[PDB]
Scaffold this active site. Structure first.
Site, PDB file in Angstrom:
ATOM      1  N   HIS A  48       0.854  -1.253   0.000  1.00  0.00           N
ATOM      2  CA  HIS A  48       0.000   0.000   0.000  1.00  0.00           C
ATOM      3  C   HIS A  48       0.848   1.244   0.000  1.00  0.00           C
ATOM      4  O   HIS A  48       2.000   1.188   0.370  1.00  0.00           O
ATOM      5  CB  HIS A  48      -0.889  -0.065   1.241  1.00  0.00           C
ATOM      6  CG  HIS A  48      -2.033  -0.994   1.059  1.00  0.00           C
ATOM      7  ND1 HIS A  48      -3.334  -0.556   0.955  1.00  0.00           N
ATOM      8  CD2 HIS A  48      -2.075  -2.336   0.959  1.00  0.00           C
ATOM      9  CE1 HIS A  48      -4.132  -1.584   0.790  1.00  0.00           C
ATOM     10  NE2 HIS A  48      -3.388  -2.675   0.752  1.00  0.00           N
ATOM     11  N   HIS A  63      -3.067   0.827  -2.948  1.00  0.00           N
ATOM     12  CA  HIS A  63      -1.945  -0.034  -3.329  1.00  0.00           C
ATOM     13  C   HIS A  63      -0.807   0.812  -3.759  1.00  0.00           C
ATOM     14  O   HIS A  63      -0.997   1.892  -4.311  1.00  0.00           O
ATOM     15  CB  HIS A  63      -2.352  -0.949  -4.475  1.00  0.00           C
ATOM     16  CG  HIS A  63      -3.280  -2.034  -4.049  1.00  0.00           C
ATOM     17  ND1 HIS A  63      -3.728  -3.030  -4.894  1.00  0.00           N
ATOM     18  CD2 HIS A  63      -3.864  -2.261  -2.855  1.00  0.00           C
ATOM     19  CE1 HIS A  63      -4.589  -3.787  -4.247  1.00  0.00           C
ATOM     20  NE2 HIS A  63      -4.670  -3.351  -3.001  1.00  0.00           N
ATOM     21  N   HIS A  71      -5.433  -3.136 -11.406  1.00  0.00           N
ATOM     22  CA  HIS A  71      -5.111  -4.238 -10.508  1.00  0.00           C
ATOM     23  C   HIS A  71      -5.154  -5.564 -11.222  1.00  0.00           C
ATOM     24  O   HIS A  71      -6.131  -5.873 -11.900  1.00  0.00           O
ATOM     25  CB  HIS A  71      -6.057  -4.289  -9.277  1.00  0.00           C
ATOM     26  CG  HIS A  71      -5.759  -5.427  -8.343  1.00  0.00           C
ATOM     27  ND1 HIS A  71      -4.639  -5.452  -7.547  1.00  0.00           N
ATOM     28  CD2 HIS A  71      -6.431  -6.568  -8.080  1.00  0.00           C
ATOM     29  CE1 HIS A  71      -4.616  -6.580  -6.853  1.00  0.00           C
ATOM     30  NE2 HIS A  71      -5.701  -7.270  -7.143  1.00  0.00           N
ATOM     31  N   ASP A  83       0.859  -5.247  -6.101  1.00  0.00           N
ATOM     32  CA  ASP A  83       0.060  -6.404  -6.267  1.00  0.00           C
ATOM     33  C   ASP A  83       0.941  -7.675  -6.154  1.00  0.00           C
ATOM     34  O   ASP A  83       1.299  -8.209  -7.167  1.00  0.00           O
ATOM     35  CB  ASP A  83      -0.407  -6.419  -7.683  1.00  0.00           C
ATOM     36  CG  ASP A  83      -1.619  -5.548  -7.879  1.00  0.00           C
ATOM     37  OD1 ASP A  83      -2.072  -5.034  -6.839  1.00  0.00           O
ATOM     38  OD2 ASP A  83      -2.099  -5.439  -9.013  1.00  0.00           O
TER      39      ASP A  83
END
Lengths: 153, 153
Positions: A48, A63, A71, A83
């Protein structure tokens, strides 16, 4: 910086130690450790944007996505820097972690030192979950445990 | 204007939010916030080398001293990068911090993002303590509470 480490803690029993190693600045980062406290199954596992824990894990924000992509999962070309997929907890609530990633870095613009690793409530559907939330956050649920990634010895 | 934040915590009642701001790469680092749970008086306020909490504050290691200087105070030429002096707790245990430092940085060789800010047990004697330790650590004692310095919004 070739080593980093994160202590994960949150409001319930989720706790863990995740180590990062990048012996080559333009090589992959090894990611490894355990998290216990976990409902068996798959758990989102993401960088994050912020190392801000002033109000708990919610403070980390979104993120890490410096390049503004949709994403996806770690192996996709279309993904956030942050991710890193799902970790899997066994029947005993213990998730052993072993990842390499070539998108995140320990240096440069993809640098995650000083940011937040967050283990999530449910599976990241990897952008393949069938709704609009899927292509933003992967629907992995709330933030069980987090910790600012820091330089390690 | 890069920004950073540390949430300080320990085995005890000491809790704090410390904020960092450096509007220019070469600018001074402005550091403000609060810490509660402190005995009245001065406590040493130091940046230590690692963002490692695997074992509590101990694992942060020693002061961040990339130039191998001798311990001194923030206003001294001979000091660690990490040597930020002392914060003062009123008699209600609250220490309102408002420092400005030009040796620490949020960028570069003397970057402290990903390292660990620590508030200690006792006053830092500033290298003016009269013994061998005074000039190693400043006799500030135990680490009451620390946090990894993280990137902030």
């Amino acid at each position: 910086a070739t080593k980093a480490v994160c202590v994960l803690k949150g409001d319930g029993p989720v706790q863990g130690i995740i180590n990062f190693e990048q012996k080559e600045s333009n090589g992959p980062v090894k990611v490894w450790g355990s998290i216990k406290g976990l409902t068996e199954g798959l758990h989102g596992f993401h960088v994050h944007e912020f190392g801000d824990n002033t109000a708990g894990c919610t403070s980390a924000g979104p993120h890490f996505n410096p390049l503004s992509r949709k994403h996806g999962g770690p192996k996709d070309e279309e993904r956030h820097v942050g991710d890193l997929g799902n970790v899997t907890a066994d029947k005993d609530g213990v998730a052993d972690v072993s990842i390499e990633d070539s998108v995140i870095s320990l240096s440069g613009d993809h640098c995650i030192i000083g940011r937040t690793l967050v283990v999530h409530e449910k599976a990241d559907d990897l952008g393949k979950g069938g709704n609009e939330e899927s292509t933003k956050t992967g629907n992995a649920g709330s933030r069980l445990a987090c910790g600012v990634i820091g330089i390690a010895q």
